[PDB]
């Protein structure tokens, strides 16, 4: 019941989902404006993205209302890099 | 009466002690001189005295910092002496503490040099901690070194050095170098024996010269693993205050040949140089094991070198050697002869009081929850040595962390202190940790104390009186036996139906004379016979001798009736000296297969028949079982006793257990569908309907016939 409490990870709003990117951008990632509003994210301020087993990168954040909240724009190149 | 009472002080000054003029009058002290205050564990300080008539005579005023440095609490008694050799300091070196300078950077040594030592002439001593205010912080520094020795006073011309790096604070605490008598519990007897055997040679060597004797040197303390031997040795060494030097068996044995002998010689020579000194060894069995199994040359040369060094020790020298080993017989026998390790001590598993004290000692820093019942834990936990208790506390804390982790997120590198404030260990955590424990000492024959009185024994009054006359008198009235010349018998053998109250009788006997009970079941003897078991019967009897007085118990002695074990037992028992207070109690349900040799005079010659309990005995036994279980009001056990003719104690206990189980099941069903937390008549009715007898009538007739045959 609780003995496996450590294994389960707490949920938080900052974590997001992975989906294929319509555009071919590599260093630029687009998210819905509402997601930025929840985290109060603005334009022109670079984002540190952390993936799995410490993999990290820096991307450029863009406004994309079309996309589901918590859904990201990252192609096979960025997916392999992370 | 020069000792003075330690009192809390409102003032925070670190170099002022205020006392009444009558305090000086007691020691005839003169104003304007510092005084030396010495507490415990070789802790001392020098303080500038001031006159404060407000303080009542015998009352002092020392800040909390000085008491903490001295390792003393409020209300303690500290010895106060004058300072005839007051001296100033010429060169003092002191470094800061990094954790104390957090939040403010820069060099505050220059800031503190002038304001704090402006002709103050504050007396200083090695290792002192002094706090000075800098900016918005109060930083404490330590006295690394002072010259000239030994303590001196901080004169203005004194040159102050600060070239070095800060040193942690808790590092000194965890060094283990500071542990007194307070850090041990449940070993009062062994601790007292070690103190008597160590302090006297060192503290007062003149006694032995006055009485004309060479003081003993070889002390060998052995006990189950993780029993605190090393901790006790360290505590006694620190309390003595003499020079210390430790040798580890694994460490010495891990280096190639030659180097081991060089290290041993260097250790012995250095210890001799700085007498008084104490030399301690660990796992001495590893370096000097039983020669019968290790035929390697390296161990032979190591043990020979150790023997030569021990023999060559000069006649008059304040050095005491202490060794530790789990198996008393494992070490090479050559070490046990006179002029070598002879003062043998055995450390047994702590009893309830010992467990309570150990738990209190360990549970002194954890965030204990409001509801804790350490007494219940002490009562429940049996067979746990100190190490297992520490592990239990650690596991309970771990379970508490498991419960509290859900609030926090482990991914982040920081945890909010608000959560930390909420950490606490509740009773359920201890219960779970105990459920997930693993004691190991009880799996081997180990001496433990028992506290069973004649009340627990349900009847057999005549046997009680016979046993008293047999055992108690020689234990408490040996003068009468010496005067009459009759030697005390030791060999007693109980025989009768199983489950008739034999082990409890043995425990009661061991309790009456205040002796260390030792248990050895028949399967242990069988394992020893087949060689799988580690300890041998010789080890059992050696431990019994070292722990005298003792009561050894031999259950199912007919299970080995094999002949080698019987021969060894006969040899060891006959070799035992009757004058020694050692007793052997054998039990067997079949007193016919026992070899005749065992029944010879000077051996297990006393035969005692154990009959089945009587109606009064059955009633008393049932009452004894029903001490914590609530009962239906008006319940009468006389009918049960009358309907249980020919029953045994075990059968009655099982009856009680099944009745309790039925009551518990009924409570479960009622709660699911605790208004009824006790037992009622129907449960006892079912239990008696499910009754039986563990012994057939034919066996009872055989027992009676055998008893009458022995009588005739
Ligand atoms: N009164 C006590 N008796 C036994 N152990 C104690 C006691 N108080 C604390 N302990 C814990 O027991 C351990 C100290 O005993 P230690 O493990 O050194 O014994 P040992 O098995 O005789 O040692 P060695 O490694 O020298 O053979 C430490 O964990 C200490 O915290
Ligand atoms: N006088 C007595 N006679 C028999 N059994 C007793 C007596 N007093 C207590 N008992 C109970 O007998 C039970 C069996 O004890 P135990 O030592 O296992 O017996 P045995 O040594 O005969 O196997 C215990 O639960 C104990 O409380």
Curated annotation (Swiss-Prot), chain A:
Quaternary data: Component of the heterotrimeric CDC48-NPL4-UFD1 ATPase complex. The CDC48-NPL4-UFD1 ATPase complex interacts with the HRD1 ubiquitin ligase complex composed of the E3 ligase HRD1, its cofactors HRD3, USA1 and DER1, substrate recruiting factor YOS9 and CDC48-binding protein UBX2. Interaction between the complexes is mediated by interaction between CDC48-NPL4-UFD1 complex member CDC48 and HRD1 complex member UBX2. Forms a complex composed of CDC48, NPL4, UFD1, UFD2 and SHP1.
Functional note: ATP-dependent chaperone which probably uses the energy provided by ATP hydrolysis to generate mechanical force to unfold substrate proteins, disassemble protein complexes, and disaggregate protein aggregates. By recruiting and promoting the degradation of ubiquitinated proteins, plays a role in the ubiquitin fusion degradation (UFD) pathway. Has a role in the endoplasmic reticulum-associated degradation (ERAD) pathway which mediates the cytoplasmic elimination of misfolded proteins exported from the ER.
Range within the parent protein: 21 to 102 of 835
Localization per Swiss-Prot or TrEMBL: Microsome; Endoplasmic reticulum; Cytoplasm
Note: Present with 78400 molecules/cell in log phase SD medium.
Family in the record: Belongs to the AAA ATPase family.
Listed name of the protein: Cell division control protein 48
Taxonomy, superkingdom: Eukaryota
Signal peptide as annotated in the record: none
UniProtKB/Swiss-Prot annotation, chain B:
CDD domains listed in its UniProt record: RecA-like_CDC48_r1-like, RecA-like_CDC48_r2-like
GO MF: ATP binding; ATP hydrolysis activity; identical protein binding; polyubiquitin modification-dependent protein binding; protein phosphatase regulator activity; ubiquitin binding
EC number: 3.6.4.6
Reaction(s) this enzyme catalyzes, per UniProt: ATP + H2O = ADP + phosphate + H(+)
Keyword Chaperone belongs to the record: yes
Subcellular location: Microsome; Endoplasmic reticulum; Cytoplasm
Keywords annotated in UniProt: ATP-binding, Cell cycle, Chaperone, Cytoplasm, Endoplasmic reticulum, Hydrolase, Isopeptide bond, Microsome, Nucleotide-binding, Phosphoprotein, Protein transport, Repeat, Transport, Ubl conjugation
Mutagenesis / variant outcome for changing residue 283 to D: Severe loss of catalytic activity without affecting cooperativity between the 2 ATP-binding regions. Slight reduction in growth rate
Residues involved in ATP 1 binding: 225-231, 326, 362
Signal peptide range in chain numbering: none
Residues where ATP 2 binds: 499-504
PROSITE patterns (alphabetical): AAA (PS00674)
Impact reported for residue 229 to A: Moderate reduction in growth rate
Any one GO biological process: piecemeal microautophagy of the nucleus
Activity control note: The first ATP-binding region has low ATPase activity. The second ATP-binding region is responsible for ATPase activity. ATP binding to the first ATP-binding region induces intrinsic activity of the second ATP-binding region. While ATP binding to the first ATP-binding region appears to prevent ATP hydrolysis by the second ATP-binding region, ADP-binding to first region promotes the coordinate and cooperative ATPase cycle of the second ATP-binding region.
Effect of residue 283 to Q: Severe loss of catalytic activity and cooperativity between the 2 ATP-binding regions. Lethal. Restores cell growth
CC annotations in GO: Cdc48p-Npl4p-Vms1p AAA ATPase complex; cytosol; Doa10p ubiquitin ligase complex; endoplasmic reticulum membrane; Hrd1p ubiquitin ligase ERAD-L complex; mating projection tip; mitochondrion; nucleus
Amino-acid biosynthesis recorded as keyword: no
Substitution effect: residue 443 to H: Restores cell growth
Function text: ATP-dependent chaperone which probably uses the energy provided by ATP hydrolysis to generate mechanical force to unfold substrate proteins, disassemble protein complexes, and disaggregate protein aggregates. By recruiting and promoting the degradation of ubiquitinated proteins, plays a role in the ubiquitin fusion degradation (UFD) pathway. Has a role in the endoplasmic reticulum-associated degradation (ERAD) pathway which mediates the cytoplasmic elimination of misfolded proteins exported from the ER.
Name of this protein: Cell division control protein 48
Source species of the chain: Saccharomyces cerevisiae (strain ATCC 204508 / S288c)
Gene designation per UniProt: CDC48
């Amino acid at each position: 019941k609780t003995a496996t409490a450590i294994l389960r990870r707490k949920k938080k709003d900052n974590m997001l989902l992975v989906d294929d990117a319509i555009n071919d951008d590599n260093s630029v990632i687009a998210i819905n404006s509402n997601t930025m509003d929840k985290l109060e994210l603005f334009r022109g301020d670079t984002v540190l993205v952390k993936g799995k087993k410490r993999k990290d990168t820096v991307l450029i954040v863009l406004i994309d209302d079309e996309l589901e909240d918590g859904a990201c724009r990252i192609n096979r190149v960025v997916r392999n890099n992370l | 009466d020069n000792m003075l009472l330690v009192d809390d002080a409102i003032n925070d000054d670190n170099s002022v002690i205020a006392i009444n003029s009558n305090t000086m009058d007691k020691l005839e002290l003169f104003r304007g001189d510092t005084v030396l205050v010495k507490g415990k564990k070789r802790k001392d300080t020098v303080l500038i005295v001031l006159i404060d008539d407000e303080l009542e005579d015998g009352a002092c005023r020392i800040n909390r910092v000085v008491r903490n440095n001295l390792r003393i609490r409020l209300g303690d008694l500290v010895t106060i002496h004058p300072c005839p050799d007051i001296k100033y300091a010429t060169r003092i070196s002191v470094l800061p503490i990094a954790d104390t300078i957090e939040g403010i950077t820069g060099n505050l040594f220059d800031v503190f040099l002038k304001p704090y030592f402006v002709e103050a002439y504050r007396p200083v001593r090695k290792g002192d901690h002094f706090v000075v205010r800098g900016g918005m912080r109060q930083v404490e520094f330590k006295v690394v070194d002072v010259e000239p020795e030994e303590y001196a006073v901080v004169a203005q011309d004194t040159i102050i050095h600060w070239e070095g790096e800060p040193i942690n604070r808790e590092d000194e605490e965890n060094n283990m170098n500071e542990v007194g008598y307070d850090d041990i519990g449940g070993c009062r007897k062994q601790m007292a024996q070690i103190r008597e055997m160590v302090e006297l040679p060192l503290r007062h060597p003149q006694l032995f010269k006055a009485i004309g004797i060479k003081p003993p040197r070889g002390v060998l303390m052995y006990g189950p693993p993780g029993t605190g031997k090393t901790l006790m040795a360290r505590a006694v060494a620190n309390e003595t205050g003499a020079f210390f030097f430790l040798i580890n068996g694994p460490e010495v044995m891990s280096k190639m040949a030659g180097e081991s002998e060089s290290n041993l010689r260097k250790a012995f020579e250095e210890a001799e140089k700085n007498a008084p000194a104490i030399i301690f060894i660990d796992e001495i069995d590893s370096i000097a094991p039983k020669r019968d199994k290790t035929n390697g040359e390296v161990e032979r040369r190591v043990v020979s070198q150790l023997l030569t060094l021990m023999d060559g020790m000069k006649a008059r020298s304040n050095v005491v050697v202490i060794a530790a080993t789990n198996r008393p017989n494992s070490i090479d026998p050559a070490l046990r002869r006179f002029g070598r390790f002879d003062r043998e001590v055995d450390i047994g598993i702590p009893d309830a009081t010992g467990r309570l004290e150990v738990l209190r000692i360990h549970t002194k820093n954890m965030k204990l929850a409001d509801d804790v019942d350490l007494e219940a834990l002490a009562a429940e936990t049996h067979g746990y040595v100190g190490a297992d208790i520490a592990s239990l506390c650690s596991e309970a804390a771990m379970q508490q962390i498991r419960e509290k982790m859900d609030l926090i997120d482990l991914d982040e590198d920081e945890i909010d202190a608000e959560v930390l404030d909420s950490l606490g260990v509740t009773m359920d955590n201890f219960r779970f940790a105990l459920g997930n424990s693993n004691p190991s000492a009880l799996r081997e024959t180990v001496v433990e104390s028992v506290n069973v009185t004649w009340d627990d024994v349900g009847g057999l009054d005549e046997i009680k009186e016979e046993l008293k006359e047999t055992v108690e008198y020689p234990v408490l009235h040996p003068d009468q036996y010496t005067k009459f010349g009759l030697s005390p018998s030791k060999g007693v053998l109980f025989y009768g139906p199983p489950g008739t109250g034999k082990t409890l009788l043995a425990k009661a006997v061991a309790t009456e004379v205040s002796a260390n009970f030792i248990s050895v079941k028949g399967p242990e003897l069988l394992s020893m016979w087949y060689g799988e078991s580690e300890s041998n019967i010789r080890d059992i009897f050696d431990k019994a001798r070292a722990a005298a007085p003792t009561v050894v118990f031999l259950d199912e002695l007919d299970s080995i009736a094999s002949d080698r074990v019987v021969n060894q037992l006969l040899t060891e028992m006959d070799g035992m000296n009757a004058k020694k207070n050692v007793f052997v109690i054998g039990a067997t349900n079949r007193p016919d297969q026992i070899d005749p040799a065992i029944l010879r005079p000077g051996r297990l010659d006393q035969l005692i028949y154990v009959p089945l309990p009587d109606e009064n005995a059955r009633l008393s036994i049932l009452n004894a079982q029903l001490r914590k279980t609530p009962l239906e009001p008006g319940l009468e056990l006389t009918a049960i006793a009358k309907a249980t003719q020919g029953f045994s104690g075990a059968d009655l206990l099982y009856i009680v257990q099944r009745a309790a189980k039925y009551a518990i099941k009924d409570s479960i069903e009622a709660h699911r569908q605790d208004p009824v937390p006790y037992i009622t008549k129907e449960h006892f009715a079912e239990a008696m309907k499910t009754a039986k007898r563990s012994v057939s009538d034919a066996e009872l007739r055989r027992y009676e016939a055998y008893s009458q045959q022995m009588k005739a």
